[PDB]
């Protein structure tokens, strides 16, 4: 329960469970599957 009206008072959001490390680990145009030759 909040005691104030404006959003500056609300508490933190906790944790963002929506993870997606692909944008940083595999920022490649063509799809690369584990095991298959990276270049062919």
């Amino acid at each position: 329960i909040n005691y104030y009206k404006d959003a500056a008072s609300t508490s933190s959001a906790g944790q963002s469970l929506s993870m997606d490390p692909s944008k940083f680990t595999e920022p490649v145009k063509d799809l690369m599957l584990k095991g298959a030759p990276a270049l062919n």
Partner: protein, 273 residues
Amino acid sequence: TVASISSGPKHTQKVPILTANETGATMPVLPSDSIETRTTYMHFNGSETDVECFLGRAACVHVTEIQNKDATGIDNHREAKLFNDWKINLSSLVQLRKKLELFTYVRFDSEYTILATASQPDSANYSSNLVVQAMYVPPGAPNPKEWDDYTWQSASNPSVFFKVGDTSRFSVPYVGLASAYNCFYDGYSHDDAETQYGITVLNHMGSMAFRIVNEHDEHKTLVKIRVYHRAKHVEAWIPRAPRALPYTSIGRTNYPKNTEPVIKKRKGDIKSY
């Protein structure tokens, strides 16, 4: 959540251990790809690794010292510390500045805690029951000139009254003009051969002017006001390389000359352990 899957001997043409880093991709190779692994579970969520917790814990980010005394005969008050003002910057303390610089853009509503402690090294029979007025100064608000200026009314300037030792707690929504703070600004405020680089509108959030409003006692009470800050509603983008060299300025990535090595040299050749 499964941590490691069960995998036995592997004799196939698919080599998950061989790749080409020239593509710039990091293949998510797991332990089951190189050895024989058993079924294990994570038993871990990662709540403390989120940017909201990594950057969202209260910490000291600035400090100053002032006095409350008989101010008679001090023409230059502010420069004599009858009240001191500090430009809001999250880049003056290094242990939080580095965590903030780990990314290029950060959006957050802030939380401030102003810690003042009363003290008297010189002869003083007691420590007054002070009432500190903390004031927010937006760009344009009259940068006060004296401890008794026409500004302390605080009609539009936010003010918080409180006694020394106890702290104020006010929240600030994200006050940037962009969608986040420009942790790195590879750009100038305008096109001039004499303008400052990096430090621009995105950097200046105003300033905090510290004072006491109580009329003076019989002695100098040198007050040191330490400021604490927690980040709220933290969102991060464009992760960057960790800070290696220290800082000398605010908002500038400039470093000193002949800086000391950061890599721990080995004891012996490369083959030593």
